[PDB]
Amino acid sequence: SALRVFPVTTELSPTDKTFEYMTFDKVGTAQIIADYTDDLPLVDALGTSEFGK
Amino acid sequence: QINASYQRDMAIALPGMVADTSKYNIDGACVVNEGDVLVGAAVQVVQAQAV
């Protein structure tokens, strides 16, 4: 029942040995401020990948 | 008769005023915890929140 319970997709070519997929993320924050403010928080981002056979 | 002309000079500063445009730094993310603060007087830090 494996092929009827879990989905089956066709993206790989017959000549491929490996594949890869990626994921992303982010961070950040905010604050209550006043006028004449010189310091402010900052934000960034990330990334990751995984493989197969 | 004889006319008169006068001259007055303004004051140069007020309490709590920035003197020059040289390199400075201001922290705007600050909260008054207890009492009132006089513009022109030093302050102190009670605690800095971690998060």
PDB file of C-alpha atoms in Angstrom:
ATOM      1  CA  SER A   1       0.000   0.000   0.000  1.00  0.00           C
ATOM      2  CA  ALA A   2       2.989   2.384  -0.060  1.00  0.00           C
ATOM      3  CA  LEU A   3       2.264   3.833  -3.506  1.00  0.00           C
ATOM      4  CA  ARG A   4      -1.447   4.391  -2.774  1.00  0.00           C
ATOM      5  CA  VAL A   5      -1.061   5.807   0.753  1.00  0.00           C
ATOM      6  CA  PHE A   6       1.785   8.273   0.210  1.00  0.00           C
ATOM      7  CA  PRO A   7       1.857  10.674  -2.756  1.00  0.00           C
ATOM      8  CA  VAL A   8       3.973   9.883  -5.810  1.00  0.00           C
ATOM      9  CA  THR A   9       5.570  12.689  -7.826  1.00  0.00           C
ATOM     10  CA  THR A  10       7.695  12.761 -10.988  1.00  0.00           C
ATOM     11  CA  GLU A  11      10.325  15.513 -11.067  1.00  0.00           C
ATOM     12  CA  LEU A  12      13.654  13.683 -11.140  1.00  0.00           C
ATOM     13  CA  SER A  13      15.254  12.700 -14.456  1.00  0.00           C
ATOM     14  CA  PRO A  14      16.535   9.129 -14.958  1.00  0.00           C
ATOM     15  CA  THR A  15      20.165  10.339 -15.014  1.00  0.00           C
ATOM     16  CA  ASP A  16      20.128  12.120 -11.631  1.00  0.00           C
ATOM     17  CA  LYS A  17      21.955  10.713  -8.612  1.00  0.00           C
ATOM     18  CA  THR A  18      21.127  13.347  -5.961  1.00  0.00           C
ATOM     19  CA  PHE A  19      18.755  16.232  -5.277  1.00  0.00           C
ATOM     20  CA  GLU A  20      18.536  19.172  -2.883  1.00  0.00           C
ATOM     21  CA  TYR A  21      15.909  21.401  -1.266  1.00  0.00           C
ATOM     22  CA  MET A  22      16.108  24.605   0.775  1.00  0.00           C
ATOM     23  CA  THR A  23      14.393  26.384   3.678  1.00  0.00           C
ATOM     24  CA  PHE A  24      14.468  29.976   4.945  1.00  0.00           C
ATOM     25  CA  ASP A  25      13.768  31.979   8.109  1.00  0.00           C
ATOM     26  CA  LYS A  26      13.998  35.467   9.631  1.00  0.00           C
ATOM     27  CA  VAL A  27      14.450  37.413  12.884  1.00  0.00           C
ATOM     28  CA  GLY A  28      13.718  40.902  14.175  1.00  0.00           C
ATOM     29  CA  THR A  29      12.010  43.055  16.783  1.00  0.00           C
ATOM     30  CA  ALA A  30      10.704  46.560  17.500  1.00  0.00           C
ATOM     31  CA  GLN A  31      10.637  48.996  20.410  1.00  0.00           C
ATOM     32  CA  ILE A  32       8.795  52.021  21.793  1.00  0.00           C
ATOM     33  CA  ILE A  33      10.855  55.128  21.050  1.00  0.00           C
ATOM     34  CA  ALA A  34      10.868  58.919  21.290  1.00  0.00           C
ATOM     35  CA  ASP A  35      12.000  61.678  18.966  1.00  0.00           C
ATOM     36  CA  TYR A  36      15.726  62.387  18.556  1.00  0.00           C
ATOM     37  CA  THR A  37      16.314  58.629  18.763  1.00  0.00           C
ATOM     38  CA  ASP A  38      19.596  57.309  17.362  1.00  0.00           C
ATOM     39  CA  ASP A  39      19.431  53.581  18.214  1.00  0.00           C
ATOM     40  CA  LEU A  40      16.960  51.189  16.557  1.00  0.00           C
ATOM     41  CA  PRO A  41      16.766  47.379  16.369  1.00  0.00           C
ATOM     42  CA  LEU A  42      17.724  45.456  13.233  1.00  0.00           C
ATOM     43  CA  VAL A  43      16.591  42.337  11.347  1.00  0.00           C
ATOM     44  CA  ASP A  44      18.286  39.547   9.385  1.00  0.00           C
ATOM     45  CA  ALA A  45      17.542  36.211   7.642  1.00  0.00           C
ATOM     46  CA  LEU A  46      18.798  32.610   7.422  1.00  0.00           C
ATOM     47  CA  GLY A  47      18.812  29.551   5.158  1.00  0.00           C
ATOM     48  CA  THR A  48      19.367  25.796   5.155  1.00  0.00           C
ATOM     49  CA  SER A  49      19.424  22.869   2.706  1.00  0.00           C
ATOM     50  CA  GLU A  50      19.000  19.074   2.635  1.00  0.00           C
ATOM     51  CA  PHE A  51      19.800  16.270   0.164  1.00  0.00           C
ATOM     52  CA  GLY A  52      18.719  12.846  -1.106  1.00  0.00           C
ATOM     53  CA  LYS A  53      19.671   9.827  -3.209  1.00  0.00           C
TER      54      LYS A  53
ATOM     55  CA  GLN B   1      15.552 116.277  19.097  1.00  0.00           C
ATOM     56  CA  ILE B   2      18.247 113.595  19.422  1.00  0.00           C
ATOM     57  CA  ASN B   3      17.264 110.056  18.475  1.00  0.00           C
ATOM     58  CA  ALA B   4      18.446 106.961  20.330  1.00  0.00           C
ATOM     59  CA  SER B   5      19.227 103.405  19.250  1.00  0.00           C
ATOM     60  CA  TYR B   6      19.679 100.423  21.547  1.00  0.00           C
ATOM     61  CA  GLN B   7      21.271  96.987  21.343  1.00  0.00           C
ATOM     62  CA  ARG B   8      20.528  93.788  23.256  1.00  0.00           C
ATOM     63  CA  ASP B   9      22.259  90.410  23.060  1.00  0.00           C
ATOM     64  CA  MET B  10      20.341  87.163  23.391  1.00  0.00           C
ATOM     65  CA  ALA B  11      21.303  84.525  25.912  1.00  0.00           C
ATOM     66  CA  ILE B  12      23.534  81.751  24.594  1.00  0.00           C
ATOM     67  CA  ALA B  13      22.042  78.647  26.223  1.00  0.00           C
ATOM     68  CA  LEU B  14      19.081  77.034  27.977  1.00  0.00           C
ATOM     69  CA  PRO B  15      19.080  74.160  30.484  1.00  0.00           C
ATOM     70  CA  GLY B  16      19.234  70.809  28.730  1.00  0.00           C
ATOM     71  CA  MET B  17      20.388  72.175  25.363  1.00  0.00           C
ATOM     72  CA  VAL B  18      22.869  70.526  23.009  1.00  0.00           C
ATOM     73  CA  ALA B  19      25.919  72.780  22.798  1.00  0.00           C
ATOM     74  CA  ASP B  20      27.556  71.833  19.479  1.00  0.00           C
ATOM     75  CA  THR B  21      26.878  69.657  16.444  1.00  0.00           C
ATOM     76  CA  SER B  22      29.968  67.542  17.138  1.00  0.00           C
ATOM     77  CA  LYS B  23      29.840  63.765  17.503  1.00  0.00           C
ATOM     78  CA  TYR B  24      26.992  62.891  19.879  1.00  0.00           C
ATOM     79  CA  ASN B  25      24.679  59.984  20.676  1.00  0.00           C
ATOM     80  CA  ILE B  26      21.114  59.850  22.026  1.00  0.00           C
ATOM     81  CA  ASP B  27      19.270  56.831  23.449  1.00  0.00           C
ATOM     82  CA  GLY B  28      15.555  57.101  22.720  1.00  0.00           C
ATOM     83  CA  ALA B  29      14.428  53.683  23.987  1.00  0.00           C
ATOM     84  CA  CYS B  30      14.342  54.702  27.641  1.00  0.00           C
ATOM     85  CA  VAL B  31      11.458  54.789  30.117  1.00  0.00           C
ATOM     86  CA  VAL B  32      11.027  56.918  33.251  1.00  0.00           C
ATOM     87  CA  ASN B  33      10.412  54.420  36.051  1.00  0.00           C
ATOM     88  CA  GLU B  34       9.837  56.498  39.201  1.00  0.00           C
ATOM     89  CA  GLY B  35       9.174  60.179  39.763  1.00  0.00           C
ATOM     90  CA  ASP B  36       9.875  63.044  37.392  1.00  0.00           C
ATOM     91  CA  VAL B  37      13.149  63.948  35.684  1.00  0.00           C
ATOM     92  CA  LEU B  38      14.352  67.529  35.249  1.00  0.00           C
ATOM     93  CA  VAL B  39      15.525  68.468  31.763  1.00  0.00           C
ATOM     94  CA  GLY B  40      19.193  69.235  32.324  1.00  0.00           C
ATOM     95  CA  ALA B  41      20.034  66.773  35.115  1.00  0.00           C
ATOM     96  CA  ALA B  42      21.812  63.426  35.131  1.00  0.00           C
ATOM     97  CA  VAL B  43      19.942  60.115  35.229  1.00  0.00           C
ATOM     98  CA  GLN B  44      20.712  56.529  36.238  1.00  0.00           C
ATOM     99  CA  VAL B  45      19.764  53.094  34.901  1.00  0.00           C
ATOM    100  CA  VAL B  46      17.654  50.924  37.198  1.00  0.00           C
ATOM    101  CA  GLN B  47      17.538  47.836  34.980  1.00  0.00           C
ATOM    102  CA  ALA B  48      17.807  46.861  31.322  1.00  0.00           C
ATOM    103  CA  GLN B  49      15.255  44.327  30.115  1.00  0.00           C
ATOM    104  CA  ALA B  50      16.883  41.268  28.575  1.00  0.00           C
ATOM    105  CA  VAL B  51      14.344  40.477  25.836  1.00  0.00           C
TER     106      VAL B  51
END
